[PDB]
Ligand binder design. Structure first.
Ligand code: SAH
Ligand code: A1AS0
Length: 245
């Protein structure tokens, strides 16, 4: 039932996280973490990467944080991230055209990520119901996650307790709201209420303030996902950075 446990998605996401770029758009997980690191003014002991997929943002965070925990619900994704952490490389297939496929390599050494791979730990888990043993963090990253969760409010309700005061929360999303992933009654934005628009960002503020303070302004970060030799997604996420009060 989970698309994120399929070979189709594995090949998209291993290319997206570790492959060459497309249309001269920079690697997206790396671009996201560059922005988080440019704004984090706290200590660098511990970061949490929620919805980490096959782990590029977690390895990027590990260049600066002593410990990085990456959590994703997809076991196929997490098994790839762990293999990269432990062996430094893996191979995968991408679609060329129809059934014609091509084998490719992901390599942490080539990306200058192998030296700190030991600072990562990857686990399967549900971001809407995180273990109560997880502790708290100096920095939390949730990339392209909130529009893929069935209970966004339940996810957000954990975050004040998960971030130390003075720490940083970074959420990015293109707000691709879909009933397949979020029941309409659980949307926190993307609709009209009492005849006025409620944007997803308004929903984020309602749930996070004043425990977090939004660093203004929000920023657009684009990304490209390769599906075949010829077909790509090209999308503009909104990044919002939040300081814990
Ligand atoms: N309940 C849940 N708990 C944890 N991860 C979840 C989840 N529902 C979906 N996900 C994960 O959220 C991700 C959405 S796509 C974004 C992946 C990655 N952060 C990137 O920016 O490229 C997928 O990896 C999916 O497996
Ligand atoms: N289309 C991709 C990228 C993404 N992630 C969250 N929203 C979007 Se659009 C996916 O569904 O994983």
């Amino acid at each position: 039932d989970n698309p994120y446990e399929t070979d189709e998605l594995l090949g998209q996401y291993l290319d997206f996280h570790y492959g060459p770029g497309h249309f001269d758009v920079p690697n997206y997980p790396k671009a996201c973490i560059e922005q988080a690191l440019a704004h984090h003014t706290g200590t660098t002991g511990r970061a949490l990467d929620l919805g980490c997929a096959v782990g590029r943002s977690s390895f990027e965070l590990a260049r600066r944080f002593d410990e990085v925990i990456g959590i994703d619900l997809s076991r196929r994704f997490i098994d790839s991230a762990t293999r990269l952490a432990e062996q430094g490389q893996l191979q995968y297939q991408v679609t060329l055209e129809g059934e014609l496929i091509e084998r490719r390599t992901a390599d942490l050494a080539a990306l200058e990520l192998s030296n700190t791979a030991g600072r990562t730990r990857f686990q399967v888990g549900d971001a809407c119901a995180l273990d109560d043993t997880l502790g708290r963090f100096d920095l939390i990253f949730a990339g392209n996650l909130i529009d893929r969760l069935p209970d966004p409010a339940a996810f957000l309700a954990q975050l004040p307790a998960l971030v130390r005061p003075g720490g940083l929360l970074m959420i990015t999303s293109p707000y691709t709201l879909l009933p397949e992933f979020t029941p309409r009654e659980r949307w926190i934005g993307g609709f009209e209420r009492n005849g006025q628009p409620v944007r997803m960002l308004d929903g984020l503020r309602h749930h996070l303030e004043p425990d977090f303070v939004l660093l203004e302004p929000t920023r657009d970060i684009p990304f490209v996902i390769r599906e075949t030799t010829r077909k790509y997604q090209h999308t503009v996420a909104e990044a919002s950075l939040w300081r814990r009060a």
